[PDB]
Amino acid sequence: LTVKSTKQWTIGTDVQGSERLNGVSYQEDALITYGDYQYVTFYETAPAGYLNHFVKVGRRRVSPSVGDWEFLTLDDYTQKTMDGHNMISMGISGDGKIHLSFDHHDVPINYRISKNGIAKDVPSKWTSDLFDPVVHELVGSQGPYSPLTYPRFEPLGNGDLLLEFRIGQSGSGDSYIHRYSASTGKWQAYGMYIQGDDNNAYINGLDYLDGKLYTSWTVRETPNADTNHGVYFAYSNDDGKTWFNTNDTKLTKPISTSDDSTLIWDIPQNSRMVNQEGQLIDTKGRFHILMRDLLSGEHQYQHYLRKADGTWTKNAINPAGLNGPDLYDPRGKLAGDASGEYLFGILPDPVKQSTGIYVATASKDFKDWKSLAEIPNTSTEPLFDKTRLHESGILSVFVRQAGGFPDRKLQVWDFELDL
Ligand SMILES: *[C@@H]1O[C@H](CO)[C@@H](O[C@@H]2O[C@H](CO)[C@@H](O[C@@H]3O[C@H](CO)[C@@H](O)[C@H](O[C@H]4O[C@H](CO)[C@@H](O)[C@H](O)[C@@H]4O)[C@@H]3O)[C@H](O)[C@H]2NC(C)=O)[C@H](O)[C@H]1NC(C)=O
Ligand SMILES: [Ca+2]
Ligand code: NA
C-alpha cells in the first residue's frame, strides 16, 4: 500500500491557552462524512479575545467531487474554561440532523441540534441560524445530566444515535447511554451501563458494527493518572441495554468496575498506561485496542487484538523511527479500510512533534507495521473520518499544529490511498 496524493487544508487558527481544546483524544467525533458532504467542528477565538471561544462547524462537498470548506460560527455560546477536557463531539443521525455536545468537565450537559435535517436536505447557505439553542437536557430522556464529562456519539444502523458520557468525577464515577430516535426526534434513557466503585471506568470509544456495540476501558482509582489499571472489554447486541464479556457471558446491568469477568489484560497501576486512547471494530468484526505502557522496559504503543478464534493477543507497535509515548503524551487512534485487511495506526510522536501514519495487514497478523505517511508539525491527539475512509479510500485526519499562537493552525489532511 502506497499514497496516491497528500492534500491539506487550513480550517482555522487554534485558540490560545495552556490546554489543548481542539484535537483531543475523546472527541467522538470531530470529522464526519454523511451522504455527499464532510463536516468538522472546532473552537475559534471570539471577538472578546483570549479565553473566549465559539464553536464552529465546517462543511464541504466530497462526492462526486470535492468542494471548498465553508464555516458557520455559533456566536451564542461562549466557551471560557481553559481545561483540556472541555472538547466538542459531533454526531449526525439518519434524519440528517447534526448534534453537538461540548465544553464539559464535571458540569451539566451542553447540547444542541440542527433545526432541520441539514445533512440530508442540504441547505444552500451554511449559517448559524441552522442550529437550535444550547440546552441542558435530552428531550424525551431523563437525567442525571451532571456532573458530566466526555460526551461521545455513535451512529447506529437504523439512523439512530447514541450519546454516552461519564456522570461523576475522576476516581469516582459511572457512565450512561442515551439513544436518539431519528424517526421520532426524541431521546430515551438507556441508563447507567457501567458503575464505578470508588473509581471510574475510562472507555476508549464506542464502536458499532452490524448490530453489535463494542467498548473497552481501563479503571482509574484516583485523579492521579498513574492509578489506571487493567484493559477491559464488553459488547452489546441491543445497542447498549445489555452487555456480555468476551466469552459471551451476560453481565450485570450496570457493569461494575469490580467485576473482573470483563478483564482482558492485567495491567497494574504505575504502568504508564493512559486512559481514553483508541479502539476499533474492523469491518471483519475483529476488535482492536490501542494503549501504551512501560512494562517491557521501554515506553511503547500497544496493540490488543480480539482474534476470530476468540483469543486476545498483545503486540507492541514498534516500527522503525517511532518514539514510544509516556503517560502524558498525545494519544493515538486506529482506523480501518473497507475490506478489513488494512489497520492504520495514527500515532502522534512526542519527540518529532508530528503524527505518523503506520499500516499493518491482517494477512501478517498485524505484525508488519510500516510507515505509510506523516503529518508534520502537530501537537494533537489525531482524529479521523471513518466513513470517508470506508467509502472512498481516503484517510482524512483533523489536527492541531504544533507552534505558538497565532501561527498554530487547525488542519484537515487527506491521504488518498492506493487501495
Ligand atoms: C474469559 O475470557 C478471559 C479473557 O480473555 C479468558 O482469560 C484469559 O485466558 C487465557 C487463556 O487461558 C489466558 O492466557 C494464557 O494464560 C496462561 C497463564 O495463566 C499462559 O500460560 C498462556 O500463555 C501460554 O499460552 C499461549 C497460547 O497462545 C502462548 O501463546 C504463550 O506463549 C504461552 O505458552 C496464555 O497467555 C489469559 O491470561 C486470560 N486473561 C485474563 C485477563 O484472565 C478466560 O479464559 C475466559 N473464560 C472462559 C470460561 O471462556
Ligand atoms: Ca465511534
Ligand atoms: Na477513587
Numbering used by the authors: 1 to 419
What do the authors report?
In this study, GA-specific l-rhamnose-α-1,4-d-glucuronate lyase from the fungus Fusarium oxysporum 12S (FoRham1) was cloned and characterized. The results described previously indicated that FoRham1 was an l-rhamnose-α-1,4-d-glucuronic acid lyase. The structure of FoRham1 comprises a seven-bladed β-propeller domain, and the Rha–GlcA is bound to the cleft at the center of the anterior side. The active site of FoRham1 is located on the usual anterior surface of the β-propeller fold.
The structures of FoRham1 WT (ligand-free form), the reaction product (Rha) complex, and the complex with its substrate (Rha–GlcA) were determined at resolutions of 1.05, 1.4, and 2.42 Å, respectively. WT FoRham1 was labeled with selenomethionine (FoRham1 SeMet), and the structure was resolved via the single-wavelength anomalous dispersion method using the selenium atom. The crystals contained one protein molecule in an asymmetric unit. Electron densities of the C-terminal 6× histidine and c-Myc tags were not observed for the WT protein structures and not modeled. Therefore, Man-α-1,3-Man-β-1,4-GlcNAc-β-1,4-GlcNAc-β-1-Asn was observed at one of the two potential N-glycosylation sites of the WT and Rha complex structures (Asn247), whereas a GlcNAc residue was observed at this site in the Rha–GlcA complex. N-glycosylation at Asn377 was not observed. In the crystal structure, an electron density peak of Ca2+ ion was found in the interior of the β-propeller fold near the posterior side, but no metal ion peaks were observed in the catalytic site of the anterior side. The Cα RMSD value between FoRham1 structures of the ligand-free and Rha–GlcA complexes is 0.378 Å, indicating that there is no conformational change on the substrate binding (left).
